[PDB]
Design a protein around this motif. Structure first.
Motif, PDB file in Angstrom:
ATOM      1  N   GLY A 151       4.740   7.405  13.381  1.00  0.00           N
ATOM      2  CA  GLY A 151       4.215   6.506  13.077  1.00  0.00           C
ATOM      3  C   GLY A 151       2.734   6.481  12.700  1.00  0.00           C
ATOM      4  N   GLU A 152       2.504   7.903  12.025  1.00  0.00           N
ATOM      5  CA  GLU A 152       1.449   7.662  11.191  1.00  0.00           C
ATOM      6  C   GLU A 152       1.446   8.375   9.644  1.00  0.00           C
ATOM      7  N   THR A 153       2.218   9.249   9.137  1.00  0.00           N
ATOM      8  CA  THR A 153       2.068   9.231   7.608  1.00  0.00           C
ATOM      9  C   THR A 153       3.152   8.679   6.910  1.00  0.00           C
ATOM     10  N   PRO A 154       2.287   7.641   5.304  1.00  0.00           N
ATOM     11  CA  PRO A 154       3.302   7.286   4.502  1.00  0.00           C
ATOM     12  C   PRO A 154       3.891   8.131   3.448  1.00  0.00           C
ATOM     13  N   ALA A 155       4.887   7.655   2.934  1.00  0.00           N
ATOM     14  CA  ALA A 155       5.965   8.366   2.344  1.00  0.00           C
ATOM     15  C   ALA A 155       5.501   7.743   0.779  1.00  0.00           C
ATOM     16  N   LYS A 156       5.954   7.952  -0.443  1.00  0.00           N
ATOM     17  CA  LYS A 156       5.476   6.896  -1.590  1.00  0.00           C
ATOM     18  C   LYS A 156       7.133   6.996  -2.215  1.00  0.00           C
ATOM     19  N   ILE A 157       8.034   5.890  -1.779  1.00  0.00           N
ATOM     20  CA  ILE A 157       9.081   5.781  -2.399  1.00  0.00           C
ATOM     21  C   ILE A 157       8.818   4.648  -3.016  1.00  0.00           C
ATOM     22  N   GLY A 158       9.579   5.365  -4.653  1.00  0.00           N
ATOM     23  CA  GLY A 158       9.177   4.519  -6.002  1.00  0.00           C
ATOM     24  C   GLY A 158       8.158   4.102  -5.867  1.00  0.00           C
ATOM     25  N   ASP A 159       7.531   2.828  -5.980  1.00  0.00           N
ATOM     26  CA  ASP A 159       5.924   2.327  -5.774  1.00  0.00           C
ATOM     27  C   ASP A 159       5.462   2.095  -4.441  1.00  0.00           C
ATOM     28  N   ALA A 160       6.326   1.563  -3.299  1.00  0.00           N
ATOM     29  CA  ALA A 160       6.558   1.053  -1.926  1.00  0.00           C
ATOM     30  C   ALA A 160       5.916   2.167  -1.086  1.00  0.00           C
TER      31      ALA A 160
END
Lengths: 441, 105
Positions: A151-160
């Protein structure tokens, strides 16, 4: 905007959600997993393989006696046999009768098949979990990139940006010591490189396949040559690695619970289905249109024409609307009764459309929202005649799914008349208490 | 090159998969269930036998010979009907939940 929810941990079933920004038209969001790999952290202690005992040529100093030193070799053996009198080709070897000496040393080393087939011994420790997600929202097509399940690392898929939450279960199918032989892995204990019981698994232990230090106890015992010939015999127990290949049970990729499929090169345990995964996706503000440019429906009436219990999309319902203007707007059923096959519908002024759904209820009392407006649908369903199929269920079976209208009538007759019987006893008890009190004063 | 087994004849009943196996070599048949408990079976088939395997709603996966594994799921067909006389409602819920209606009655 930001939409946070929780998705189930199933692979082939998409998760459909409808984000609701007030003042803007809703956006249909669809998140679908592709992989789910549990990757533990391993270190290689040692390998093992079948041995190959090599015998050097014995010395025959056959008038006198000879002694050996202690050469550094795994399972090295020395002996001296006195008075052998051997017979080679072309007569006896030497003149000195009844006092001779043969050494016949021996030494254990690994075979040449140890480069091809060997068993690697690993100790595992809990590590990263990652997954690959296929996503879409609104008019954006399907774009996929793998994420980290924490629950820490965000991933950019598309623009979201998607933040996949931690799994609700700490379950991993690997015990603390695993053996990787070829294609499949096992759950087996080690003697931990110090000991070897000569017949089970650690007869030969080597830290690397090209390593120079070897552990070997194969109970190698020399034997006396007989009848006057030059040869070196010995006796030893067979290799336990060859014995382990016969008695090994089922591998871990055939007895794993939750339908895990075990892969090898990072030692994954792919596609298990346990627990649930929370989600949190930040949607860009350019994907929201104003509500004045979108249809808005009213006067909705929902009729179910056909429903089937089976977990195939056999449920059909047609509703009747009268929208403000023509265009496209999504549909969604937020309850857990039925899932909807369609994502969006094309509207007009005072028309009717149909959608296909799938439910596990006898009487589906679900409601669905079209064009930010809700409508309740009701009906009856019939069981299917197929007994076994080869696709998973699309819906989720609840606790009160199987109770019908006749079974609810018998429960309420049983519960209602039981309490009405026991209240009449309480009413008649308090009635005679008043008339006995009224007799006195 | 390794031999490929003949295809089994699969027959479906209520929560039961029946496999008619007719091998020509000693052939391995391993199954497992896709639930919380694997409950694994493993046996070598030498003579033509039939085996009945209980498939629940979670699933079942069987490997026969050198064939790729196949997965099967069981639906909620049942035998009785829930609407009708009380000797039909009790029978329908017994074929669906065999233990819950025994202690529920």
């Amino acid at each position: 905007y930001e939409h946070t929810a929780v998705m189930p941990n199933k692979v082939g079933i998409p998760y459909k959600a409808l984000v609701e920004r007030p003042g803007y038209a809703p956006v249909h969001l669809q998140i679908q997993l592709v992989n789910t790999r549990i990757i533990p952290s391993t270190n290689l202690e040692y390998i093992t393989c079948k041995y190959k005992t090599k015998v050097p040529s014995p010395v025959v100093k056959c008038c006198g006696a000879t002694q050996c030193t202690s050469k550094p070799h795994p399972d090295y053996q020395c002996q001296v046999f006195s008075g052998v009198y051997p017979f080679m080709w072309g007569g006896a070897y030497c003149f000195c009768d009844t006092e001779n000496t043969q050494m016949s040393e021996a030494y254990v080393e690994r075979s040449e098949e140890c480069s091809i087939d060997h068993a690697k011994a690993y100790k595992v420790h809990t590590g990263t979990v990652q997954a690959m997600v296929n996503i879409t929202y609104g008019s954006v097509s399907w774009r996929s990139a793998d994420v980290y399940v924490n629950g820490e690392t965000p991933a950019k898929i598309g623009d979201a940006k998607l933040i996949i939450g931690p799994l609700s279960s700490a379950w991993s199918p690997f015990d603390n010591k695993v053996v990787v032989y070829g294609h499949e892995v096992y759950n087996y204990d080690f003697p931990e490189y110090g000991t070897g019981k000569a017949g089970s698994f650690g007869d030969l232990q080597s830290r690397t396949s090209t390593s120079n230090d070897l552990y070997a106890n194969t109970n190698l015992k020399l034997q006396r040559p007989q009848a006057g010939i030059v040869h070196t015999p010995f006796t030893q127990v067979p290799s336990g690695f060859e014995r382990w290949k016969k008695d090994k049970g089922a591998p871990l990729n055939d007895v794993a619970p939750f339908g895990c499929s075990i892969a090898l090169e990072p030692l994954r345990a792919e596609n298990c289905a346990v627990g649930s995964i929370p989600i949190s996706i930040d949607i860009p503000d350019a994907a929201f249109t104003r509500i004045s440019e979108t249809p808005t429906v009213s006067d909705l009436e929902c009729k179910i024409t056909e429903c089937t219990y089976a977990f195939d999309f056999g449920g059909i319902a047609t509703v009747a609307y009268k929208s403000s203007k023509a265009g496209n707007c999504p549909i969604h059923s937020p309850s857990g009764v039925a899932v909807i096959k369609e994502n969006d519908v094309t509207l007009a002024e005072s028309g009717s459309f149909t959608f296909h759904f799938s439910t596990a209820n006898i009487h589906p009392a679900f409601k669905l929202q079209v064009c930010t407006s809700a409508v309740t649908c009701k009906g009856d369903c019939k069981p299917p005649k197929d007994h076994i199929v080869d696709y998973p269920a699309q819906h989720t079976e609840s606790f009160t799914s199987a109770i019908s209208a006749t079974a609810w009538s018998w429960i309420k007759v049983l519960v209602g008349g039981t309490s009405a019987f026991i209240v009449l006893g309480l009413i008649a008890t308090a009635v005679v208490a008043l008339v006995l009190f009224f007799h006195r004063h | 090159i390794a031999t490929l087994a003949p295809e089994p004849l699969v027959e479906h009943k209520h929560r039961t998969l029946i496999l008619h196996l007719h091998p020509d070599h000693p052939t391995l048949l391993t199954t497992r269930s896709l639930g919380s408990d694997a409950n694994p079976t493993r046996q070598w088939i030498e003579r033509p036998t039939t085996v009945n395997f209980t498939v629940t709603g979670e699933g079942l996966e069987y490997t026969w010979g050198n064939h790729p594994p196949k997965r099967v799921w069981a639906q909620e067909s049942g035998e009785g009907n829930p609407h009708g006389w009380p000797h039909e409602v009790v029978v329908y819920y017994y074929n669906r939940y065999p233990l819950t209606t025994i202690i529920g009655l």
